[PDB]
RNA sequence: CGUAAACGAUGAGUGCUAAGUGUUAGGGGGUUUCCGCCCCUUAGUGCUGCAGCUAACGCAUUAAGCACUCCGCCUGGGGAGUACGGUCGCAAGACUGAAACUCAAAGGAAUUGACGGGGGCCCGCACAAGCGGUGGAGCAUGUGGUUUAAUUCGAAGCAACGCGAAGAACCUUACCAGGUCUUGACAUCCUCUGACAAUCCUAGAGAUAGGACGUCCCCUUCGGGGGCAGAGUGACAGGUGGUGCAUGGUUGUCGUCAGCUCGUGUCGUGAGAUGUUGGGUUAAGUCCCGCAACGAGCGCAACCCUUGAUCUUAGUUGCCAGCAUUCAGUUGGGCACUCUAAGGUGACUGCCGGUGACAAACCGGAGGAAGGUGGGGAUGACGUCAAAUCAUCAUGCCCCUUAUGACCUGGGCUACACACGUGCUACAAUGGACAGAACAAAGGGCAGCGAAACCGCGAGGUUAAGCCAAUCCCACAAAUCUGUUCUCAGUUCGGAUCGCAGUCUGCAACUCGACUGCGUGAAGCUGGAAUCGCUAGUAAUCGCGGAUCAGCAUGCCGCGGUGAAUACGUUCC
């Protein structure tokens, strides 16, 4: 069988990042990169406006707050249902960070996902936020189950 | 759910069309006229052991070639055979019919005549081992790189009907350059219906 | 014959096949007929050849060892079957014996 | 007490009958005072092994060998080590020990399989990792029940249930009700006498008739012969009647799994084994190496079809690069380019390096359009489910025959309290509505495709160009992108249901068609237990096309448009 790997596209015409196009491919509903590109650039223009900063550094700070060190996997032996904590390899750190940004942004609820993604980045920058509940809770699940490693 | 017929599998690779023309405006009508032709000619020469009929359509004219493996039963005395054969076809089709009859040397390599030869022996109450083994020796001496004759039905045994393989040599139904003759025949016996499936791997083309 | 079939069907068929068939069918290649006798070097090492020799009732000459059975071999020679000079000596004597025979 | 799987499941004694090898307690020898090595012999205790034995497993000098002596015990399984009697025992029980009755087996050892909540290895959207759903609502569709005059029949876990049905208004259509028919609606017969047709009127729901009118057949040397018609007569027909547990043929499924076998040989009393196992390897019983096997066949792969690229030929109806004109590739012009369709070339672990046995193969590199069966398709081994199909067909047998057959109209297969598969549409801002701009592929068209114009709000309508089609049409692609607008509500969401008015198809849209126009606007605010699909141009989403077909598509079959997320891994199902 063996492990297979995938690829992704380097630039964005404004905000030249790999991972921002990785977020473009994420949150794509029904095969529409155009709508996700529109949502993303209008959101980052809100992040450049509402806070007078470049939104690249705010976006990496939000990622750094969300990227989880420790997943907690499963291990059922007998009738025990133990969860076992896993040191996450950093690709999955970035992609769990992007899932938590996208999911808790669209789960928030405001008058566009432009605004939801903007305010979720602004919350995950100054770490207290909705996806960071999931960050904290995964680290708490790894903290409770640390007896197994 | 099993094997695709090798005749229908190798059409348009190496095995030609039997029915060779091009459609103008009554393709269905030409088809069913030729089905009536093949029914009529195979009924009439199922005494005279005709295997295959290739039909042309040549702008109001039909060239029928007939592969028989004996000439003088079907071209015969010359006059009478071509009279009773071209004349009734000119009637029951409605236009000109020309008949060219190619004779199959090595009568035991064409699977239609071979399957009919096994079917008649079952109808002649010859045992269903003797038919297939005798015919396999006849075909493998007539020269074939493999033969497979499979007979199924009630073999003279009432409440269980089973399939019977006899074969010699390579019969490679998956090689798509094979030139394999496949042919069925049916044998209505007193105990029911027997089905003869013979296919003869004869040699491939590089 | 024709040496041009495919670019490598001569390889995958011919070469691969020549290797195994030459190495194993050796100099018994041109045998054409059943042999009269059989000269082996060790019966314990080669019970299969000794077995079907005694079955086919071919009389056998042979060097045996002290752990081998002299009842099974028709013509028993006691000597060294893994010292190369003793086996060279015995095959030498017997090949000279058969070379002195056809006249 | 007096019993144990109290066993070596192997009575005691004795003698004989190859070896190799540990070990326990002794003895003696050949050099050495020794340590210690070797040799030799006892008695006990292990293992492997020849002859011999055995049904085989195996035993084999510690016999299950070859013998002799003596003892104990067995004579199918159950009932049953039971009951009765006796002896012994405090007792529990022990020992001795049947019979009626009942069965055709019980049993040993071995072989092939299958299975294991046994071990090993491996693989697959199987699990995980994700992404989207189904289960909730509405509707479309199929199925169970139930209502029925009939709700025709067939399928029934995976492998039935948007299945046969690639199109139930009539037909189909079998089923029901009523009117009917009886060599018959369909095909060979026999005998005639000539054409059959065609229309009109009456019936009649129509079939079926009464009729009128009309019959023109022909071919020859005169007898006839190719039709069709009726008219008899009887052979016969006709069954979508039953049996898929009588069948042929054709399929599903395991499963595109990698297996399934045979020849000759040898092994075994035999069943069987061997090959086919073992090591590495593979997508693969693929391939190599070793091997009591050597081969072979069906499978696997390859050839076959498509897509990925380029060369030659071939440029019109296709293409517009430079040559000017054009509302327009329209014209002149050109085969460069795309395209098309033929022949090629091409990718083979071939070359490099590395590993591994040097093999087979594997990991990376260069080249290249293409890299390790490149993506897909077609191909479905021996056999498994007495799987499915007697309703596509052909069928053996059994049944019906003035009817279980045939015609005709009307209904039903669309019923509906309920469950239940598959699907479509939504519940909404990545949204809804309104306006502008663009980009496709593949396929269809002769009583068919139908431009343009005109009219109608619209579904569409009238006249009609072109097209048997790389020309002309279907054909104004849609999500998309760009502006305007609502602002998070059962709403500018959603469209069910329904009233009215229309349109098209067709004898005919009432049960029972699709579509339009106006209006009404429902359940529904992302779905419990449970559960499915997918590893890349895939899933998700968007339209287009075609079969079927007058008309009916949310189904199916293909086509493109945008177009992801994840695979640590085999712990678990």
* CA distance from start to end of chain B: 31
Residues making up chain B, counted from first to last? 206
Q: Are B120 and B114 in contact (CB under 8 A)?
A: no
- Exposure string of C27-46, with b = 16+ CB inside 10 Å and e = fewer, is eeeeeeeeeeebebebbeee
Other beta carbons within 10 angstroms of residue A96's beta carbon come to: 19
Query: By CB neighbour count within 10 A (0-12 exposed, 13-18 middle, 19+ buried), where does B139 fall?
Result: buried
Residue B3, C-beta contacts closer than 8 angstroms, at least 6 positions apart: B173
Q: Which residue has the tokens 């069918």?
A: C25
- Tell me how far apart the alpha carbons of residues A139 and A93 are, in angstroms, rounded to a whole number: 13
Q: Which residue has the tokens 């450049």?
A: A48
Q: Of B47, B46, B65, nearest to B55 (Cα)?
A: B65
- Tell me how far apart the alpha carbons of residues B172 and B144 are, in angstroms, rounded to a whole number: 13
Q: Of C55, C42, C37, C27, nearest to C83 (Cα)?
A: C42
Q: Which residue has the tokens 């509402």?
A: A50
Strand D: positions under 7 A of a protein C-beta atom: 123-124, 126, 130-132, 246-254, 265-267, 287-292, 295-304, 348, 350, 378-384, 386-387, 394-397, 429-431, 446, 468, 479-482, 487-488, 539-542, 561-570
Q: Of A121, A21, A117, nearest to A65 (Cα)?
A: A121
Tokens of A69: 């060190």
Q: Are A33 and A27 in contact (CB under 8 A)?
A: no
Q: In what order do the strands lie in the sheet with B180-189?
A: B162-169, B146-153, B192-201, B180-189
- Tell me how far apart the alpha carbons of residues A62 and A123 are, in angstroms, rounded to a whole number: 8
Rounded (10°) CA dihedral A135, A138, A140, A141: 180
List the beta bridge partners of residue B11: B15
> Max alpha carbon distance in chain A (Å)?
56
- Tell me how far apart the alpha carbons of residues B173 and B170 are, in angstroms, rounded to a whole number: 9
> Does the nearest atom of strand D lie within 7 Å of A22's Cβ?
yes
Q: Are B152 and B182 in contact (CB under 8 A)?
A: no
Tokens of A23: 């977020």
Q: Are A6 and A81 in contact (CB under 8 A)?
A: no
> Does the nearest atom of strand D lie within 7 Å of B1's Cβ?
yes
Q: Give the CA radius of gyration of chain C.
A: 19
Q: Which residue has the tokens 């008649």?
A: B120
Q: Which residue has the tokens 């059975």?
A: C69
Q: Of B51, B14, B17, B44, nearest to B198 (Cα)?
A: B51
> Does the nearest atom of strand D lie within 7 Å of B13's Cβ?
yes
- Tell me how far apart the alpha carbons of residues C27 and C50 are, in angstroms, rounded to a whole number: 19
- Tell me how far apart the alpha carbons of residues C44 and B88 are, in angstroms, rounded to a whole number: 85
> Does the nearest atom of strand D lie within 7 Å of A35's Cβ?
yes
Nucleotide nearest to B178 (CA to C1'): D303
Output the DSSP codes for C20-39.
Answer: HHHHHH-SSTT--S--S-EE
- CA B70 → C1' D508, Å? 62
Residue B73 phi/psi, 5° resolution? -95, -25
Q: Are B62 and B93 in contact (CB under 8 A)?
A: yes
- CA B32 → C1' D402, Å? 38
Experiment type: cryo-EM
φ/ψ region of A85 (left if φ > 0, alpha if ψ in -120 to 50, else beta) reads beta
Output the DSSP codes for chain A.
Answer: ------------SSS--HHHHHHHHTT--SS-HHHHHHHHHHHHHHHHHHSSS-HHHHHHHHHHHH--SEEEEEE--TT--EEEEEE--HHHHHHHHHHHHHHHHHHH--S-HHHHHHHHHHHHHSS-SSHHHHHHHHHHHHHHTTTT-
- Tell me how far apart the alpha carbons of residues A27 and A20 are, in angstroms, rounded to a whole number: 11
Q: Are B151 and B194 in contact (CB under 8 A)?
A: yes
Chain B neighbours, 3+ Cβ pairs < 8 A: none
> Does the nearest atom of strand D lie within 7 Å of A27's Cβ?
yes
Q: Which residue has the tokens 């393989």?
A: B165
Output the DSSP codes for chain C.
Answer: ----SSSSHIIIIIIHHHHHHHHHH-SSTT--S--S-EEES-TTTTHHHHHHHHHHT--EEEEE-TTS-TTT-SEEEES-SSSHHHHHHHHHHHHHHHHTT--
Q: Of B73, B72, B34, nearest to B53 (Cα)?
A: B34
Residue A27, C-beta contacts closer than 8 angstroms, at least 6 positions apart: A36, A39, A102, A106, A113, A117
> Does the nearest atom of strand D lie within 7 Å of B28's Cβ?
no
Please write down the HEC assignment for all residues of chain B. CCCCCHHHHCECCCECCCECCCCCCCHHHHHHHHHHHHHHHHHHCCCCCCCEEEECCCCCEEEEEEECCCCCCCCCCCHHHHHHHHHHHHHHHCCEEEEEEECCCCCCCCHHHHHHHHHHHHHCCCCCCHHHHHHHHHHHHHCCCEEEEEEEECCCCCCCCEEEEEEEECCCCCCCCCCEEEEEEEEEECCEEEEEEEEEECCCCC
């Amino acid at each position: 069988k063996g492990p297979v790997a995938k690829r992704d596209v380097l630039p964005d015409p404004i905000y030249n990042s790999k991972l921002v196009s990785r977020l473009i491919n994420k949150m794509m509903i029904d095969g529409k990169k155009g709508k996700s590109q529109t949502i993303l650039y209008k959101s980052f223009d809100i992040i450049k406006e509402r806070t007078g900063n470049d939104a690249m550094e705010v976006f990496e700070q939000a990622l750094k707050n969300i990227m989880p060190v420790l997943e907690v996997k499963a291990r059922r032996v007998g009738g025990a249902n133990y969860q076992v904590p896993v040191e996450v390899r950093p690709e999955r750190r970035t992609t769990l960070g992007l899932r938590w940004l996208v999911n808790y942004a669209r789960l928030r609820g405001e008058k566009t996902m432009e605004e939801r993604l903007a305010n979720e980045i602004l919350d995950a920058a100054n770490n207290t936020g909705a996806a960071v509940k999931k960050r904290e809770d995964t680290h708490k699940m790894a903290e409770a189950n640390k007896a197994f490693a | 759910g099993q094997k695709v017929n090798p005749v229908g599998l190798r059409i348009g690779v190496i095995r030609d069309w039997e029915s060779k023309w091009y459609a103008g405006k009554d393709y269905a009508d030409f088809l069913h006229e030729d089905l009536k032709i093949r029914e009529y000619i195979s009924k009439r020469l199922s005494d005279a052991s005709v295997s295959k009929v290739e039909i042309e359509r040549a702008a109001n004219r039909v060239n029928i070639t007939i592969h028989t493996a004996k000439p003088g039963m079907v071209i015969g005395k010359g006059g009478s055979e071509v009279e009773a054969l071209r004349k009734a076809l000119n009637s029951l089709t409605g236009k000109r019919v020309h008949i060219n009859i190619l004779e199959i040397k090595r009568a035991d390599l064409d699977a239609q005549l071979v399957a009919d030869n096994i079917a008649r022996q079952l109808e002649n109450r010859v045992s269903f081992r003797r038919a297939q083994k005798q015919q396999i020796q006849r075909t493998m001496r007539a020269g074939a790189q493999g033969v497979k004759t499979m007979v199924s039905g009630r073999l003279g045994g009432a409440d269980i009907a089973r399939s019977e393989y006899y074969s010699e040599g390579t019969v490679p139904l998956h090689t798509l350059r094979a030139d394999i003759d496949y042919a069925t025949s049916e044998a209505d016996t007193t105990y029911g219906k027997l089905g003869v499936k013979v296919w003869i791997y004869r040699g491939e083309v590089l | 014959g024709t040496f041009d079939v495919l670019p490598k069907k001569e390889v995958v068929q011919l070469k691969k096949e020549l290797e195994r068939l030459e190495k194993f069918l050796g100099g018994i290649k041109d045998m054409k007929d059943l042999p009269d006798a059989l000269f082996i070097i060790d019966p314990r090492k080669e019970r299969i050849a000794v077995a079907e020799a005694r079955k086919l009732n071919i009389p056998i000459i042979g060097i045996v060892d002290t752990n081998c059975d002299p009842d099974e071999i028709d013509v028993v020679i006691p000597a060294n079957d893994d010292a190369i000079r003793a086996v060279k000596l015995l095959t030498s004597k017997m090949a000279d014996a058969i070379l002195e025979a056809k006249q």
